[PDB]
């Protein structure tokens, strides 16, 4: 595994910079799109609206992320009810067969760009009920998953770390910069 740089070696490395695309763009047009691409990502990154799914006993720890101790809202994360206004879905709990068509539909109704987070073992791979006769073995069978948060339930910080991974994943989208090459 790639280990972190030592202090002395890191003592020379240049400051990272904010944009993951750097300021090394050859042309003006490319550079403007790169900077303009950051503006989109800065927007979507800032305000990520979950859907308030809350299926099973991960759902309780999905409340304590909104509790004052950790305060999801500090990061611009605001819970919402309608899937139209919701941007992210946190599938937290055991997605049984009876639910499975309902999650698919609710996910479909969510407008793009939509990212899915899988909370806990139940939604990751079927978890403790993996072999049950009425459990979908992981929600990735039904909807694409963008971040997997392990745990049972994941700690509140663990989910917070998951959300920040989604911000970083959002931060590095190349929606515009890849249109130029296309």
């Amino acid at each position: 595994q790639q280990t972190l740089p030592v202090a002395e070696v890191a003592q020379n490395l240049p400051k990272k910079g904010y944009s993951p695309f750097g300021t090394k763009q050859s042309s003006v047009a490319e550079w403007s799109l790169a900077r303009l691409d950051d503006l989109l990502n800065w927007g979507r990154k800032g305000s990520i609206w979950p859907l308030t799914f809350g299926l099973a006993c991960c759902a309780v720890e999905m409340m304590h992320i909104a509790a004052p101790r950790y305060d999801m809202d500090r990061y611009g994360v605001v819970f919402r009810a309608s899937p139209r206004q919701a941007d992210v879905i946190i599938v937290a709990g055991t997605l049984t067969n009876k639910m499975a068509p309902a999650l698919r539909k609710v996910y479909d109704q969510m407008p793009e760009p939509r990212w899915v987070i899988s909370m806990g073992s139940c939604a990751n791979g079927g978890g403790y009920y993996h072999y049950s006769y009425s459990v979908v073995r992981g929600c990735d069978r039904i909807i694409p998953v963008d971040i997997y948060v392990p745990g049972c339930p994941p700690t509140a910080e663990a989910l917070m770390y998951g959300v920040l991974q989604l911000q970083k994943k959002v931060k590095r989208m190349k929606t515009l910069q890849m249109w130029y090459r296309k």
């Binding site: 793009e112 694409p144 998953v145 963008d146 989208m173 190349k174 890849m178 249109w179 130029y180 090459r181």
Partner: protein
Amino acid sequence: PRPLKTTNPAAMKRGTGGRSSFNGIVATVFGATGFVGRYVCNKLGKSGTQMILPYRGDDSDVIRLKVTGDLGQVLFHFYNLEDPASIRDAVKHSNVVINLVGRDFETKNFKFKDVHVNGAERIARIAREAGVERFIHLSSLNVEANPKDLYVKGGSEWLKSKYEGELRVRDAFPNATIIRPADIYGSEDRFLRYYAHIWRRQFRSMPLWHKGEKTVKQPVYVSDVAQAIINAAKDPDSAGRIYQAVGPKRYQLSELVDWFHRLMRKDQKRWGYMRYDMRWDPTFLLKAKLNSFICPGTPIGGLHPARIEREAVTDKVLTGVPTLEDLGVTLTTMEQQVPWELRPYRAALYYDAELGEFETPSPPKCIEARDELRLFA
């Protein structure tokens, strides 16, 4: 007796065929994000195939395919069509390569020369170097050495490139399979939507070339085409041959469009549907010309002069070239599928009709072989 390429047991067919099975096929679907790709990839995922899905754009578009397969059976690989070093990485372990790369229009970075003939050659040439056993390519059915225009002065460029791309493919990868579909449809398509879109109309109308009465088509359901691609992939007998992917019945373009607007409840009696002759109104050609210019990413409503020329040309299914029936596919008729395709495009869909308040539409009338002789004089 075809030699077995590798006897390593881990790389042999195993299991009942479900998602956890394995076909011994390691495919690489170039252009899996497109319309056809969604259906090819899913059919592969059912069998147990391991697929690499190269994608040029942002991962967001292709991430939805991860659901198609099973764990570790779907892998993405960013690549640039011009850079061969990128492509080699995605074809250095494959047994099958499928080339669904193409466009209905040109771009600022990719003219039809770069995509259909130069691009497809590069994928095929690199594949031969790596040692891919099988290869599959797509091309239009009406492909011709020099196709004459019918209504647009430059509407035949797309077919010209497709023909030329077909030859270079056979040049680089001599035992490549070629499947020649014609007017694929069935969802997220550009045939049943290109005729249901607002742009295509003129406030309620439908400018069709000759009212569509001199155009005959054999549309094929996309799933049947995808089944053909996979069946051709499982069989070595199908290598190095041309296949024509056409439906079971032939319809006049006027006959089809009437039937849609009956299914869509957009009948002339109430809705106000009516068919121009496209030659009479020059406003329509301006819309495409304006539409192509204005939109940077993709034409709206699939409307642009290149697409117009596709509509005008009547399908020319050659005699003696194998069809998907040779590959064992059982073609779905339009009557089976289309009435379910157009349910979300129906007009006055907010009604909550009582049972029987909308009468079932009459089916379309195919065109007999003899009638085509008379229809064309």
